[PDB]
Amino acid sequence: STAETTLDSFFSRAGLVGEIDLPLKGTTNPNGYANWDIDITGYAQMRRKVELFTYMRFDAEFTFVACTPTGEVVPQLLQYMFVPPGAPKPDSRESLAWQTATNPSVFVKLSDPPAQVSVPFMSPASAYQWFYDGNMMGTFSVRTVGTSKSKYPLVVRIYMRMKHVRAWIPRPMRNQNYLFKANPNYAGNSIKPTGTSRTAITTL
Amino acid sequence: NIIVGYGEWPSYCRFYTLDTKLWEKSSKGWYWKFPDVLTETGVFGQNAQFHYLYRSGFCIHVQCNASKFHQGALLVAVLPEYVIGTGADGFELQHPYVLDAGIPISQLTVCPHQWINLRTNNCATIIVPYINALPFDSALNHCNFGLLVVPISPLDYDQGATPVIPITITLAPMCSEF
Amino acid sequence: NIIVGYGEWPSYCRFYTLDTKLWEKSSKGWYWKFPDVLTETGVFGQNAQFHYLYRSGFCIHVQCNASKFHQGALLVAVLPEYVIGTGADGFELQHPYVLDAGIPISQLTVCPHQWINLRTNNCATIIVPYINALPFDSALNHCNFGLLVVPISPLDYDQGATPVIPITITLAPMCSEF
Amino acid sequence: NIIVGYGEWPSYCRFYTLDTKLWEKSSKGWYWKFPDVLTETGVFGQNAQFHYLYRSGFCIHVQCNASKFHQGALLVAVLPEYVIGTGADGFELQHPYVLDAGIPISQLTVCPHQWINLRTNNCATIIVPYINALPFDSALNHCNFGLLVVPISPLDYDQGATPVIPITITLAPMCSEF
Amino acid sequence: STLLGQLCGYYTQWSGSLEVTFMFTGSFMATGKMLIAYTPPGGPLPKDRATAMLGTHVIWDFGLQSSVTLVIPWISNTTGLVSIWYQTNYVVPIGAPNTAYIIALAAAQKNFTMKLCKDASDILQT
Questions:
Q1: Chain-chain contact of E94 with B165 (C-beta, under 8 angstroms)
Q2: Secretion signal: which residues (chain E) (predicted)?
Q3: Mutate to test the interface with E, among C75, C115, C156 (most CBs of E within 10 A)
Q4: B115, C63, D5, D97: which has the fewest C-beta neighbours closer than 10 Å?
């Protein structure tokens, strides 16, 4: 009963944000680690939905699914360390940031159910704002446990769900194509109508 | 009539008449930024740049006087955190259809707004409370909101009448804190 | 509105409509003398010259009808014992600046007076009591006061409109004695 | 102690610390003029030259710190309408005997005054009400009074001690009106 | 030209408050706005309309009102200044005159006084 249009229902599903490749050989990540800055716009449809308002406040829930490029399941161990905002990030496999006790880690196996954690509201202000006339959530670092390189190629996929959603000050929805990230810039030489057109005003 | 933005009056935690804009037959629209528009004016302007933390509400009156043989319509609206995509005299809209920011003008009536129809009325009053994610901010580095005046219906008249219509904006700070 | 001269109503010890004056773009002003203006008119006129002692008050209405596209202003005043320095149709002022008597027009507002602004009103009423140093006088040898109608602001209009504005004076004797 | 000039407290109809004067073995005396001394300083200074009528009282503290092996005496006095005969740093007396105006210094104790004896005390406080023949005057063209600090007994010490003694003046406006 | 000036030309000292009234004698279809400002003694004339706005002023609307009044505070015995600026332009329809006139009326308040009579006149008897 009008409970599908609430904001909690509007933002209620886990969507794929981000993907990490750890190839056996190549140039994508020569080592066995990667850094992924947390963002909600990894999901393609998220930006236009969130930018309907000016201020937002929510928690997050992350799930990690790992497998071989073909989809196989292999006996491997991973780390999944979380770097809070304002803290240094790893630079190599031998970096000392991988064992700093203030960065929580989740040791898990591939032959296991996907890992799941929760992240609270991490802003100094009272809400995130997508427009500032004048939003760091953290970082996830993924590696393979060991002093030697792994024997398999791996892919990690991250899914995020938002909980306890609140919003303020609605705005008009986006009309033109985006050009940059965190920028309302638009192609000024090609402006398109909001919808379709017809031949005359007197004809259906 | 008088509308109160989001149904909230300014609270705690004189009149300033700017120059006159001349509405023409080919005008596109103008906008002003707050509190940038009142930073070089008077005691408010001195306090804005001679302090560190600022917090204030506002009351905006827009008027225009025209004859009974003129026609046209204007939309007046207030948009918090109005970032522009591609002083006290304001700027001019280059692409009024996309509000110069990639958003449609047809949905601008979702904000605190008023209509000026030359055949019906000539005044519009909007009261804006303080909107921010923090109790205090900087008056010289952050613009809280912007004010828009866009002619939805073009100005028209007959030859021999006055070809420019004056639009005057007068505003008064409310519950200001420094 | 209606003003009463010196705050006194006429006391003891019909309507007469004169001809119409045509206000023009170059008019200077006119004046009438009392009770000379009503000495050849009707029963009052017969009694004025068929008696010896006369005493009366007056009530004067001045009106003018013009369109909404005309402009101008008139000053109507009453001056007792109005002696002129260098009938029912009045005379024309030769030097309206000095009131034809050596006194400034700018201080004429010290007498019982009214203003006619074409954009505001079109009527003026003045009530004059009896003023003299004796209880009775002669109606054919002494003029008690005079009435002045001077355009302070010139009449203006556009080509194609009516170039003359009618000014009609109607007066009624009050508390007359013979 | 604290003395009140003429036994009157300032009435209706912060601290300012000036620079330090160095008392020497050959010093003659200094004087300051009011409210000239506080016309280029702070909010009081802005109000003095940004208004037309001014009226205020004052409270003056004079201090000096010296060792127990120094000696000397100063006379501090306030003289209304101190006209001189033949800023915030004051002037120096050329002929302290005649007070630079033809009047003896020995009779200066007829004004609100205090004594500073280095062997007895080091402070002097004077409270001055508003003195004028008119309720209000001009702050930029009329000097109400002057303050004098004259060493009646010369400063003396032994070789090896500090040869200059600091005299600091701090004043606070009271019951100021603009 | 006012009776107050002529009457105070017979004395030596005076003090009190004044008032000035402005009357608009344009057509019924004309509109516009004016700014009337007052500057206290000792100040200079404002350089522009914006400077005059930061002070004692009033905004006069032709359409709303035909007359406005301006109370001048205490005067005595430099003097205050009164200036009139254009706020908007003169708006008028087709068929109405392009020019109008303003009439100013001045008087004194109830706290005005005069003292020390003089005679002081230059009109010759014959």
A1: no
A2: none
A3: C156
A4: D97
Give dist(CA E33, CA E63) in Å, integer. Answer: 9
C-alpha–C-alpha distance, residues A7 and C75, integer Å? 72
Q: How far apart are CA E120 and CA B152, in angstroms?
A: 68
CB contact under 8 A, C68 and E28: yes
Asked if B139 and B39 count as a contact pair (C-beta separation under 8 A), the reply is yes
If one counts every other C-beta atom within 10 angstroms of the C-beta of residue B174, the result is 16
**Closest CA of chain B from E121, distance in Å:** 47
Element (H, E) at D40: none
What is the Cα–Cα distance from E32 to B67, expressed in whole angstroms? 10
Å between E88 CA and nearest CA of chain B: 6
Per CATH, which fold does C1-178 belong to? Jelly Rolls (2.60.120)
Partners of B92 in beta bridges? B30
Give helix then strand counts, H and E, for chain B.
1, 10
Residue showing tokens 């009449």: C155
Which two structure tokens, joined as six digits, stand for D19?
Answer: 């620079």
Distance CA A103, CA A140 (A): 10
Phi first, then psi, for residue A119 (nearest 5°) are: -125, 130
Q: Is E40 on the interface with D (CB under 8 A)?
A: yes
Whether E93 sits inside 8 A of B162 (CB atoms) is yes
Longest pairwise C-alpha distance within chain E? 58
> In whole angstroms, what separates CA C98 from the centre of its chain?
18
User: In sequence order, what DSSP letters do the residues of D107-176 get, joined into one string?
Assistant: TGGGSSEEEEETTT--EEEEEE----SSS-B-TTT---EEEEEEEEEEEE--TTS-S-EEEEEEEEEEEE
Name A77's Cβ contacts closer than 8 Å, sequence gap at least 6. A107, A108, A109, A110, A144, A145, A146
Instruction: Give the nearest partner residue to A129 out of B79, B81, B107, using CB atoms.
Output: B81
CA distance B66 to E90: 10
CA distance A42 to A17: 4
Q: D86 in helix, strand or coil?
A: coil
Beta-strand pair B123-128/B2-4: parallel
- Method for structure elucidation: cryo-EM
How is residue D89 written in tokens? 């740093």
Backbone angles phi and psi of B156, in degrees to 5:
-140, 155
For chains A and D, tell me whether 3 or more CB atom pairs sit within 8 A of each other.
no
Contacts of D116 (CB under 8 A, 6+ apart): D62, D64, D73, D74, D75, D76, D122, D123, D124
Across the interface, whether the CB atoms of E25 and C109 are under 8 A apart is answered: no
Residue E123: CB atoms within 10 Å: 5
Domain limits of chain D? 1-178
Of the candidates B67, B158, B160, which has its C-beta nearest E29's C-beta? B67
Residue among A107, A106, A105, A112 at smallest CA distance from A75? A112
Q: Distance of alpha carbon B124 from its chain centroid, rounded?
A: 10
Contact B67, E92 (CB under 8 A): yes
Looking at chain D, the residues that come just before a C–N gap of over 2.5 A are: 13, 86
Chains E and B touch (3+ CB pairs under 8 A): yes
CA atoms within 13 A on the CB side of A181: 7
Taking an 8 Å cut-off on Cβ atoms, the answer to whether B67 and E31 are in contact is yes
Which residue, among C165, C170, C169, C168, has the nearest Cα to C73 in the 3D structure? C165
CB-CB: which of E3, E28, E95 is closest to C158? E95
Q: How far is B130 from chain E (nearest CA, A)?
A: 25
CB D147 within 8 A of CB D78: yes
Q: What one-letter code names the amino acid at B110?
A: V
Residues C111, C5: Cα–Cα separation, whole Å: 8
